[PDB]
Design a protein around this motif. Structure first.
Motif: not given
Ligand SMILES: [Cl-]
Ligand SMILES: [Cl-]
Ligand SMILES: [Cl-]
Ligand SMILES: [Cl-]
Ligand SMILES: [Cl-]
Ligand SMILES: [Cl-]
Lengths: 142, 142, 141, 141
Positions: C81-89
């Motif tokens: 899951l990509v949720d807030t974009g915190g991990t994605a960035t």
């Molecule tokens: Cl994320």
């Protein structure tokens, strides 16, 4: 001859094992024996609150990638120990790890610290990632 | 101490048993040992193409309702034979039936013709109809 | 406030749809799982693609507990899951040449992935299969 | 032409919603399952209501293979699905005083039941949990 592992049973077995591994504070992390150990690793990681998860990738034995060190403070988790060829190498390379598996056949069984389910040597195990839920005809065709 | 039966495992066990009961033409019908035998009965009925399904209801033994006759041509199916009190009565009242169960503990085991899974006498079995899929906290609380 | 409840079977259906888009397998050196959420989807992709090289990244100036070396060239990076974009960035920063994929995407994470299978509303209260298990419940009587 | 695929867990959720509406249990002499579709929902209701008196009706001038005696007074009659109304009309004929309930109802069967949990379109291609099982599938690679 055939042993079918469903996702829900794998999780039941992995949660039973996680309960034996409490308390979580005794562990630095989890090493997954790839590829089979990835799913049980993710379940143990969730149950134990452990965010440090690494892998060892074994393919005539070839190591494609391995976690550094002797395993001290680590759980090493496999889905199955079978012939004992992989289990021998893992037990040797991570001698201070707590080496666990969900399923053990007899040739692999005494090379781990702990396992959940004994399976006969000649049983063909289907793990959840090998199967799909599909329409099945009545066995009788009636 | 605890044995958890999921719906998907019960079906796997019931389908294994249905395969042993082929061909379907040898059967007049199925008698379900109520209440526990209803689900496995429905699975066997689907697999065997059998539309004649009846019940026997046993509650110090009381028979609330029973199928007529000596069981000739019938499968009698239970989910579990446990103390052997019910299994004795069923084996006695339907002496010509093919008496099968999914699960057998030792006190009930030799009173059936066939079973799929041995369970220890002192294990608490949870059948799928006793459980729900619910949120579960991480075992570690971390 | 409805729960969005993912079953093991649905997670596998979505992971297989993704694995089909990642064929052929030959183009990949391996898979990097985003710990912990990406481990189960990594096990599925690795079975489907016949990939035995699987590694992880464990995120906390970006701080990591552990990371696979390199800039991600030749790798699939997989999250659940990509949720807030915190991990994605943090994944884009560490692995700018990986093929970054996810099972689920919320709009805040969506722009930062190469592929996703299922998009859900930002507010979705999502339970993954490993958050649920069979438990005894007393009869209604 | 989408398949409507019922899981064991969803069937049980629906059977429990129905069992809650049938409380209190004391008001029932028993449950009559419509064979074969009603057997699994009968096992669920019987656990939830603590009812040990369970009987069946097996339908083929109405012809039956077997039927519970009486006009249904005090009984729940349970089916999995009322589809064409063919089975529903035979149940009303045989058991005019039963509380006739179903998990699923299509519009052709709906007028002929006392209660249902889930209504679906007449055209719905429905697979019950006992029509599906885990089977080996080759990897996508
Ligand atoms: Cl994320
Ligand atoms: Cl091994
Ligand atoms: Cl018994
Ligand atoms: Cl995490
Ligand atoms: Cl039928
Ligand atoms: Cl109908």
């Amino acid at each position: 001859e055939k042993y079918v592992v469903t996702w829900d049973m794998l999780q039941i077995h992995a949660r039973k094992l996680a309960q034996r591994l409490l308390p979580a504070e005794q562990w630095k992390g989890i090493i997954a024996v790839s590829r089979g150990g990835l799913v049980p690793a993710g379940i143990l990681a969730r149950e134990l609150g452990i965010r440090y998860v690494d892998t060892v990738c074994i393919s005539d034995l070839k190591v494609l990638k391995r976690a550094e060190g002797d395993g001290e403070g680590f759980i090493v988790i496999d889905d199955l120990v079978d012939t004992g060829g992989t289990a021998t190498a893992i037990r040797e390379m991570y001698p201070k790890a707590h080496f666990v598996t969900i399923f053990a056949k007899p040739a692999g069984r005494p090379l781990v610290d702990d396992y959940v389910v004994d399976i006969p040597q000649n049983t063909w195990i289907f793990q959840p990632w090998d199967m799909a839920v599909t329409f099945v005809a009545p066995l009788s065709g009636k």
